[PDB]
């Protein structure tokens, strides 16, 4: 609740093409503003990530090498056409606020793509076009187009594939060809990307979280003037460390605690742990899980 900006992993919330916001997004901590991550905490907006708040974001995942970047990491909306992203971008209805030059997402290939404008141009309110900016200052970050969370995983999902009842096309993916009169609508569809899989769209979203005493399940803080503090400096029980630490019952169950000489205090992050998802009856460990609003066409049978 109070430690939403104490990030798991490195905490990097910048896109590679945009550097000048590194003083406050690299990493994100208790203090400072970050246009790439702050927008994720407006309540009611991004509910799935706000549920699993202590799991990584997309930019956060690519800078922890969990999610790979696509070839050209940014598609142009001013070039000859700038096609590599447009085919995937049109099928999704999104809404970009003003002053944003870039907006990122998980492509259908499982990598992080982004759509970006030339300097001092901004994205329109549908994220499909670039226009000469109307203000004086552009946002120095990239706007996430997906309610999403990510984690490290080695679970092979190459055998997996999108299966949805009565669906002909979901976003880019064409599951089959249909002869019946179709119903077409923008739907908020869930999805998940795995180790060796593409984007797998889902009918139901069934998740389960196994809690553990691993490092990413904790948040440590020292001297509101709180600043983050690496847990790797705290020595475990029967180990060696450079600092001294105290924690809750969960933290002191594994690491040694000293109530008087501790540099920092570590709590157990609520809603943290290994998350698994149920795809067509089988439980798997996904790399990322999210929602996105895409064009779904359905048969009448």
């Amino acid at each position, epitope marked *: 609740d109070p430690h939403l900006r104490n990030r798991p992993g490195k905490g990097h919330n910048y896109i*590679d*093409g*945009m*550097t*000048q916001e590194d003083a406050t997004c690299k990493p994100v901590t208790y203090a400072g503003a970050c246009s790439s991550f702050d927008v994720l905490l407006e309540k009611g907006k991004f509910p799935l990530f706000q549920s699993y708040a202590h799991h990584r974001t997309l930019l956060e995942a690519v800078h922890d090498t969990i999610i790979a*970047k*696509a*070839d*050209p*990491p*940014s598609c*142009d909306l*001013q*070039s000859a056409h700038g096609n*590599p992203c447009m085919k995937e971008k049109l099928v999704m209805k999104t809404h970009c606020p003003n002053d944003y030059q870039s907006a990122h997402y998980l492509n259908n290939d499982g990598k992080m793509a982004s759509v*970006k404008c*030339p*300097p*001092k141009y901004e994205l329109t309110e549908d994220c499909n076009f670039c226009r*000469q900016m109307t203000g004086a200052s552009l946002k120095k970050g990239s706007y996430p187009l997906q309610d999403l969370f990510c984690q490290s995983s080695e679970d092979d999902g190459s055998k997996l594939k999108t299966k949805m009842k009565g669906v002909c096309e979901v976003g880019v993916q064409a599951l089959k060809k249909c002869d019946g009169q179709l119903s077409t609508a923008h739907e908020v569809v869930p999805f998940a990307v795995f180790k060796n899989s593409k984007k797998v769209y889902l009918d139901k979203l069934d998740l389960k979280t196994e809690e553990n005493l691993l490092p990413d399940s904790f948040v440590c803080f020292e001297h509101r003037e709180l600043k983050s503090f690496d847990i790797s400096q705290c020595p475990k029980i029967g180990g060696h460390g450079s600092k001294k630490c105290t924690g809750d019952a969960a933290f002191c169950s594994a690491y040694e605690c000293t109530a008087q000489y501790a540099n920092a205090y570590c709590s157990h992050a609520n809603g943290s742990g290994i998350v698994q998802i149920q795809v067509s009856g089988v439980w798997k460990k996904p790399l990322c899980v999210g929602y996105e609003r895409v064009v779904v066409k359905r048969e009448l049978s």
Partner: antibody
Amino acid sequence: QVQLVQSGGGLVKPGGSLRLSCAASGFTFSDYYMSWIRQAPGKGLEWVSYISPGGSTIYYADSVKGRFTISRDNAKNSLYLQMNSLRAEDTAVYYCASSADVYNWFDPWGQGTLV
Amino acid sequence: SYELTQPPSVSVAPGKTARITCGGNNIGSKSVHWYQQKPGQAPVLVVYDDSDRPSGIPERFSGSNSGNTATLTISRVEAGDEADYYCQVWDSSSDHLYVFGTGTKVTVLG
């Protein structure tokens, strides 16, 4: 520190071919676009081509389009420019540059190589 | 094609201030970059993003951009500032995508 360092011969007869190679050491080089900018003797700078961090989506300038081929070997941290069907208008000093995204400002450049 | 115009010569006495104007149609809407090149060298980025400096460039260098003119201003000119200064922009038109100016040679008097 970052040190884009170049090699490659630069004395040929018209219609010939050459090959410049720019080796990178100090950044990741897998996340940065790479461009080639030439400078005629005494004149200013002309951009020639750019290659994306992954190797796909290459762009050339119509002055050079069709003749040169820019490639990269991210494994061995290198960036190649193969020149074919050369002629006197190409005689210049060629530099490699890194931008970190397609719209950006060409931070550190190679040392230069005459042709 | 989008062209950037640049005065070929600029003389300035040491201690005075030097000014170099990059002229492009509607250039206030693009990000302007300034490189410095000494003889026998490679161009070095002295200014990017219309007004900002990479680490290593002294506070003597300042960038500005408005309307149809973007100016690089070198305060406290030193004899070592004799060089070619080039402006550069991105332009997704007519095949160049990175338009360098004609270049300005700054020579220090005295």
